[PDB]
Amino acid sequence: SGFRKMAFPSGKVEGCMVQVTCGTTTLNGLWLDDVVYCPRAVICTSEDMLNPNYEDLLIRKSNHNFLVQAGNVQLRVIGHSMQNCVLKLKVDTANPKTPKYKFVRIQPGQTFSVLACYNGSPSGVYQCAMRPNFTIKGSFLNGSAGSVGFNIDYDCVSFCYMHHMELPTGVHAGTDLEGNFYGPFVDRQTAQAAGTDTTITVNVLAWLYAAVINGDRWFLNRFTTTLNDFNLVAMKYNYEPLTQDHVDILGPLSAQTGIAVLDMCASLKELLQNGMNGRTILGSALLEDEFTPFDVVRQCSG
């Protein structure tokens, strides 16, 4: 038992991380088969990063303008193209460490592991969630662009995030591995603001179930609520609305614990209305919303 913010083992991804330099700009790339993927920001002229014309900049590059290093080995780029906000560098060597993988675009509330890298080398691994406002609350410094987020529930590495940028509030924005940004953000240093963030209600409920599974019961109550009454309380606290799909997803946990979903919603309502009373749940004094129902089942699977 116990409950921790657990990331996936990062080895399968470490074996894919390279350094990409174009001109005076360096960031990380993801070397899968004979293609290195990285943010197209690497081709910016380190002067025009407000309104770069990436199509214009790329056609002026030669393959030999890109310096790709995998450890001591320099990889030869033999072609380059752009898919949305991601640059694809064809190299003459397939990565022998390429895992089984796929690219997946995730929904807000989904969680994933981040391998934070600098100059193609890993610094550390942590767990994140796609926020409702399509930012992620990462830990990234200059040079971290091209770090990726991933899941490995089985033997397949699901790449879902490539890091690009930090916003003024210190949260982060990036793309899927097809180069489409999450949210309305763009890979330009024009002023951009994240929308108001909200709490991922379905994840809070999953975590309350995780607490009951681990022996907590102090926050349970005799009350039940309707989905609409709960949703009226939730929006008053900047909580995401709960849908019937969420209720369905919470089914297995409600069955494993014997506590109906709307019975747990009433617990959440009381915690919101009356606070936590200086008490903790699973070692936290605030409600945690970056564990999904799937995360809870995986970590609490006997």
């Binding site: 700009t25 360096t26 910016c44 990063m49 662009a145 240093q189 002023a191």
Partner: peptide, 10 residues
């Protein structure tokens, strides 16, 4: 801005 593409320069 305070909106930064987190590449590294030089």
């Amino acid at each position: 801005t305070f909106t930064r593409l987190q590449s590294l320069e030089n």
